[PDB]
Amino acid sequence: ADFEVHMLNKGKDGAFVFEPASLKVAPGDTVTFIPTDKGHNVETIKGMIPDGAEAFKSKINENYKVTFTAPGVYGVKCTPHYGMGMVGVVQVGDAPANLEAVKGAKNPKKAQERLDAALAALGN
Ligand SMILES: [Cu+2]
């Protein structure tokens, strides 16, 4: 199954957001990260990927398709806007094994508040 996540100058929770900020997909599904507005990318947050996952970083303005082969929860950021809160989480599969590591990982305040709301929305 194929999903999209958008990089936006403005959205639900204010400036510099991914939408949806919280998504559940199955292992093997794809997410295309679509910069609706100019100036965004996607990159995994160091410490917020599961066992055997590869880190990734797209170029600015790239429509970037990821096939999520390793199950678990992923924290993602936009590289320039991370510190302004531009984050998302992708849960790949059921009962993610790294849920504690992701809840506990250290992030700038604005990113942590948005990560916590995205994690809460997953309802683990
Ligand atoms: Cu951005």
From Swiss-Prot:
Q: Where in the cell is it found?
A: Periplasm
Keyword terms:
Copper, Electron transport, Metal-binding, Periplasm, Signal, Transport
Q: Where does Cu cation bind?
A: H40, C78, H81, M86
Where mainly located? Answer: periplasm
Its domain of life reads: Bacteria
| A GO cellular-component term linked to this record | periplasmic space
Pinpoint the Plastocyanin-like domain residues: 5-93
How is the co-factor bound, per the entry?
Binds 1 copper ion per subunit.
Q: Indicate whether Ribosomal protein appears among the record's keywords.
A: no
Q: Molecular function terms in GO for this entry?
A: copper ion binding; electron transfer activity
Q: Give the required cofactors.
A: Cu cation
Role according to the record: This soluble electron transfer copper protein is required for the inactivation of copper-containing nitrite reductase in the presence of oxygen.
Protein's recorded name: Pseudoazurin
- Originating organism: Achromobacter cycloclastes
**Underlying gene:** bcp
